[PDB]
């Protein structure tokens, strides 16, 4: 769960849930 009320698509820093991960190929905020 990110933060502005919506439920799916951008993000990627401090994640909880393996299904949300993608293979190492980017910076981000974490």
């Amino acid at each position, epitope marked *: *769960n*990110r*933060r502005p009320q919506d439920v799916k698509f951008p993000g990627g*820093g*401090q*994640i*909880v*849930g*393996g*299904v949300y*991960l*993608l*293979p190492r190929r980017g910076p981000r*905020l*974490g």
Partner: antibody
Amino acid sequence: QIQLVQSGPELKKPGETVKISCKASGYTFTDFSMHWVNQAPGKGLNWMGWVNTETGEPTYADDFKGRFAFSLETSASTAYLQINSLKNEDTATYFCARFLLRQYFDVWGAGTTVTVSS
Amino acid sequence: DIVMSQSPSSLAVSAGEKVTMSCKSSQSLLNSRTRKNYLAWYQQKPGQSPKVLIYWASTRESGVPDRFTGRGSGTDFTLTISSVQAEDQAVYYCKQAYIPPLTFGAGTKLELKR
């Protein structure tokens, strides 16, 4: 060493509110999601939720929605677990574990055991 | 919510013998993309906090005997402590983290015989 130091044992009466803490020492309190797990006396563990230690944004599990409150004092590498309107069922001990992007808990705290009673 | 079921409950084996525990999940825990299974094994001794043993359902955490082994994939995983000793007496938990909320099995107690 990387370690988490929680508050002391707490004894509150039914209905009373309580705030236990989890001091983060040994790493950067803002790089990992801090979670809170509970263990009813004699029972297994249960994931309550977690606080984003970079956004503050707290995510809660359903079984623990309403009455429970995650937060933090970033400036002090500390996270706080609050429980309002306490019930006898809420008796148990609460842990706080550092979570990785590898999806597991590499470090917990001795856990704070709160006991509700009159 | 992914429902975790551990087997057996308790389990008594003599020192030296290799024991085996099972952990099934409500649904797949395999991220087709990362190609990793999000199941970890925790060991928790009496009064202590839990202690992570294995993650990615197979990968053994740092500072752990090759005695503890985690096999499995999808929904069928199992922990196998080869050559069991008294220092292993505890309750073992498998937690799934593939999709929130995170969940634990009911725990499998490992006692020792003598």
